[PDB]
From a paper:
GMP synthesis proceeds through two steps, the first being the conversion of IMP to xanthine monophosphate (XMP) catalysed by IMP dehydrogenase followed by GMPS (guanosine 5′-monophosphate synthetase; EC 6.3.5.2) converting XMP to GMP4. GMPS is a class-I (trpG-type) amidotransferase in which the catalytic reaction occurs in two physically distant domains, a GATase (glutamine amidotransferase) domain and an ATPPase (ATP pyrophosphatase) domain5. Hydrolysis of glutamine to glutamate and ammonia occurs in the GATase domain, whereas formation of the intermediate AMP-XMP from ATP and XMP occurs in the ATPPase domain. Ammonia generated in the GATase domain attacks the intermediate to generate GMP.
We purified and crystallized PfGMPS, PfGMPS_C89A and PfGATase, and solved their structures by molecular replacement to resolutions of 3.6, 3.15 and 2.6 Å, respectively. The 108 C-terminal residues of the ATPPase domain are involved in dimerization. Interestingly, the nucleotide-binding site of PfGMPS comprises residues from two adjacent monomers, strongly suggesting that the dimer is essential for enzymatic activity. Small angle X-ray scattering (SAXS) confirmed the dimeric structure of PfGMPS in solution corresponding to the active form of the enzyme, as seen from the good fit of the dimer crystal structure superimposed onto the calculated 17 Å resolution PfGMPS SAXS envelope. Upon superposition of the PfGMPS- (conformational state I) and PfGMPS_C89A/Gln (conformational state II) dimer structures, the two ATPPase domains remain invariant, whereas the two GATase domains differ by an 85° rotation and a 3 Å translation when going from states I to II. Probably binding of ATP and XMP by changing the conformation of helix 371–375 could be responsible for the interface rearrangement. It also seems plausible that the charge-mediated interaction between Glu374 and His20, along with the hydrophobic interface contributes to stabilize PfGMPS in the conformation observed for ligand-free and XMP-bound enzymes. His20 (in close vicinity of Glu374 in the apo PfGMPS structure) was mutated to Ala, giving a 23% drop in leaky activity. As the structure of PfGMPS shows inter-domain interaction via Glu374 and His20, the rate of adenyl-XMP formation in PfGMPS_H20A upon mixing the enzyme with ATP and XMP was measured. A progress curve with a single slope and an apparent rate constant of 96±6 min−1 was obtained, and the 1.6-fold drop of the rate constant validates the inter-domain interaction seen in the structure.
Numbering used by the authors:
A (entry chain A): 5 to 59, 61 to 378, 398 to 485, 497 to 555
B (entry chain B): 9 to 139, 152 to 230, 235 to 279, 287 to 354, 368 to 379, 402 to 485, 495 to 555
Write the structure that this text describes.
Amino acid sequence: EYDKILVLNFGSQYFHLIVKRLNNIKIFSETKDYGVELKDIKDMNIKGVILSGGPSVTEAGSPHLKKEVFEYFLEKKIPIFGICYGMQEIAVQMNGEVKKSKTSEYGCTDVNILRNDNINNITYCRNFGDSSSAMDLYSNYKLMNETCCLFENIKSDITTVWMNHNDEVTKIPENFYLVSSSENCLICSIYNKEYNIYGVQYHPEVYESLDGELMFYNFAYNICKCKKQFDPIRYHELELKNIEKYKHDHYVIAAMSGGIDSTVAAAYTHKIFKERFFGIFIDNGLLRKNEAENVYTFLKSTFPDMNITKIDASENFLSNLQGVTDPEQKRKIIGKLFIEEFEKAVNNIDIDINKTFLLQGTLYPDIIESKCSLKFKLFEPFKYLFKDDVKTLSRELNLPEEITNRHPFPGPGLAIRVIGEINKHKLNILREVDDIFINDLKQYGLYNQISQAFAVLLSSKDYVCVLRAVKTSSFMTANWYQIPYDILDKITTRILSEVKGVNRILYDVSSKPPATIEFE
Amino acid sequence: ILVLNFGSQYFHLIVKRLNNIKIFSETKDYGVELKDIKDMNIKGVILSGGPYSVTEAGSPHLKKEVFEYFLEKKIPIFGICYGMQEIAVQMNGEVKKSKTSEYGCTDVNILRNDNINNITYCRNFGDSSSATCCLFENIKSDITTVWMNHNDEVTKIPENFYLVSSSENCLICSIYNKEYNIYGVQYHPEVYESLDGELMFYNFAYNICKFDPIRYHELELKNIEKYKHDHYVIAAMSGGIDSTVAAAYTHKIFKIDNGLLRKNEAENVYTFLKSTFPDMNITKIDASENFLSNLQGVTDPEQKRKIIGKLFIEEFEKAVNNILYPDIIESKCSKLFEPFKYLFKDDVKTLSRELNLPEEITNRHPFPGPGLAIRVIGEINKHKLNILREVDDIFINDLKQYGLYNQISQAFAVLLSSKSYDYVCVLRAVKTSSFMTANWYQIPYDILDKITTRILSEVKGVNRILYDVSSKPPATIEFE
C-alpha cells in the first residue's frame, strides 16, 4: 500500500488531537484499536507507528500492546514513538518498570528539555531524591548533546506541554537517553535511537503545547520522512471533481436534518450535479419547536430544487416509546425508526434502488468511532475534516452566518433530553421553553460563544426543567459555561412566570467529562 | 392596633418595624369580621398590602360592612399600598393600570402649595402637562424616600381627599384625609428601606397612641419565674438557636434526635449540648431506624410531614416516658409554654451576644421541621442519607471556609433521583428577604466551580450535581 502513520489508542482521549495535527501537518493518519492484531496491517508501507494511551498499568489487567505487534513494530528502519501510556507500555514491554506517580499536577506545564548543561538549569532537582547538586540525579541517568533531531528551532529552550499523568515510569527500558524533567514527575521522556523510540509522558497532543505541534511535526517529518502525504480538504474536492464528471448518469441521496455537516455536503455536492439527488427530512418527533420547518425553509432558500421531500412522522415514535426508561433502548429505538422511515421515504419514490449513494452528515470522528471498543456502496462525503474546518468551509460556501454557529443536535433529540414519559404535550411545552431560554441566551450573543446550550428536562412528577450549558474545546472535553446573574435572573424568571406547568428550575454545573453531554 | 392581612410579604415586616415603639397587635385575614372585635380598641388601623389588583379578581373583598363599622368606631385610619386601592374602591374613586410603573428605588417627592408650585415631574401626565402631613411632621425634611411596590397605579382618588404627595411616574402616591385621618401610601413605608417610613409608623403611630416588646417579655419571664415551681422544662432542646437561648436563660436561672441531622455534625451536636450544657440534660433518642424503615418506598407529602410529625409526637412521649413571633403571626392572619413572643430573630441575635454566647449562634441554618424528610427523593434508605449528609456538609464546608457562608441566609442540599449507578443533586442557596419570600443569591463562579469539583471528586452515587436557581415566589425554598 502507500499508507504512512499508525496511531494506537489505549483510551487516549486526545486521539483526535493526534490526528488533527498529523493532518494539519500535511500528513496521513491511520487508526486502530490497541489490541490491534497485525492481522489488519496490510504489508502496507508504513514508515511510522505512534502509540498513545491516556486512559493504571500498576493494576493487573490494564491495556497495552501484544508482543508480536511490538516486535514487528520495532523492525530496524521503521520507527516507534510512544506517548503517555504508550510510553509506559513501551517501557514495560521491554525491561522497564513502573510505579504510581505522586500527586501529579499536569497543566499547561512549562517543561524543560534536558542536556547536561541543563542538568543544572534544572532548578528543580531538589525533589525525588538527594541533596542539591543538580548534577547527582543526572549523573545517575543517561544524557547528552543539545541538538536532538526531534527538537529544532524551538527558539526557546523551555518546552510547555499541557499534560495528565496519574502514573509514572521508574526505570529506563533499555538503552536510550534523557530529554525532559517535570517538577513532580522526574524522568519524563526518553529518546531511543536504535529502537527509534521516543517516549513522552506529556501530552504533545494539544494546542496547549505549541512547541508541541512542533514536536509532532518534527517527528514525522524527521524520524520518518513521510515524504509525500495526502491533503484532506483537497479530498472532499477530488472525490468531487471525480464525481462531477458523471453527474447526469448518476443518482444521489442526502440525509438532511439541518445539521451543518449536512447542508454543507449537499451543497458542495449539488453544483454541476443538480437534478439527481433526493434530500429527505425525517421528523424525529423531537425538535426545537418549529425546527422542522425552519430547517426546511433554510434548505429551500439556500437552493430551490433538489428534489426536496418532507415526511412528518411524530406519533409513531411517541407511541413506540410510550413509557420506557431504558436509555440505550431509546437509542436503539430512534435509530430503528429513522432507518425505517428513511427506507420508506426513499421508497415513496419507487425507483433506481441500487444506483444511489446515500450521503450522511459525517466528518472524521464518526468515521473514527467506526473502530472503537438496502445497502449501497456508500459515499459519505466528509471523511477527513474537522468540525471546525468544515465550519470554515461553511463560510467558504458563503452560506449564512447562522448555520455555522449551530449547536449540533444529538439525534434522539428531545427524547433523551426528555427524561420521563415522552409524549406530545409535555414535550411540546419544553420544546417551547427551550425556546424561551435559547432565545434569551442568544439575545446577548452567547450563542456564538456558547458551544452548546439545551434546556433539558426532568420529570419531577408540577414539573422542573433543568438547563444545561457546555464549553466545547472538542469531542471528548466538555467544560461548563457560566451565565451571569443578570441574564439568568431574567431568563429564569421569565420561564417560570411565562410557561404554565413548571414549579422549579435547576441549572447544571458539572464539569468536563463527566460528559453528561445530554442527561440520557 | 389591628392589622388586616392581604398577603404582601412586607406585611409582617410591617408589624416588626411597628413593634419597636411601644406598640401592640392582634391578627386577622382579609375578612376580619366584626365578631372578631369587641371591648376591643386601637386608635389606628393598619391596612395590608397585597398583590391583588382591585379592578382585578382576588382583590380581597374587604367587608364593606365592616368598613362601615370601622369608620363608625371613631378612630383614625392608616391604609398602605393596596390597602389603599381597596379602600379607594370602597369609596367612590378608583384605579387603573401600571403607569410605566416599577418597585422600590424610586424616590418620592412631597407636596403643598409652595411645594405645589415645586413639582417638576408632572410631565408626560396626559400628552404633556405641567405643574407637614401627619405623616411627615418631623422628618419635616420635605421629601420622601422609600421602597415602592405598586403594580396598581391609582389614578383617581376617592372623595374629599387631597394629596400629601405625588411622584415620578406614579402620580398619586399619598393620600391625606381629614375626614378620618386617612392616608393611603402606594410606596411601601413598611420596609427597612423607608427611613422616613420609620416615622410614618411612629407618628401616625403615636397619633394613634392616645408596651415595648423586650420590655414585656423580660417581665413575663421573671414573673413566670416568680413562683419558681419550675422543674418543668419548657420543651426539648433540639438545638435550635432559639432553643438554646431559651433553654439557657431559663434553665440557667433555674434547675431530640434521629429524625435526620448531618453527620459527625451529630456527635458534635450532643457534644455541643454538653459543652454548652455544663450541668443540664442532653437527653437523646438516637434510634430512628424504625421510621427510616417505614420509609423504604413510601412518599405521601402532607403525609410525609405528618408522619415525621406523629413520629415526633412519638418522641415526646418516649422521652417523657423515661422521665417565636413570626411563626405565630403567620398562623393567625392565615386563618410548659412558649416562653415569649415579643421579639424577633434579629433581636434574639443581639440577645445572644448580649448574653455572651459562643459564636456560631447566628450563622446556622436551622432547617426546622423534617430535620430532613423533605429532601427524601421518595424512598428512604441509609445510603442516601449518609451520602446526602455528606454532601450537604461538603456544601456548607466550603462556604464556612470561603467566607460567603455566613454570607448566605440558608444553604443545604436536596437529593434528586433521576440522573453504572446513579442518583444526583441540587445545591440550595437562598439569601432571604422575608418570611413570606426568599430570593436566591448568586454564589460566585470560580468559587462555585471549585465547590462543584470537590463534590464531584468525593463520591459515586451522585452522577451529575446541579445548582438550584429559584427565588420565592414563584416556588418555595425547600424543594419537596
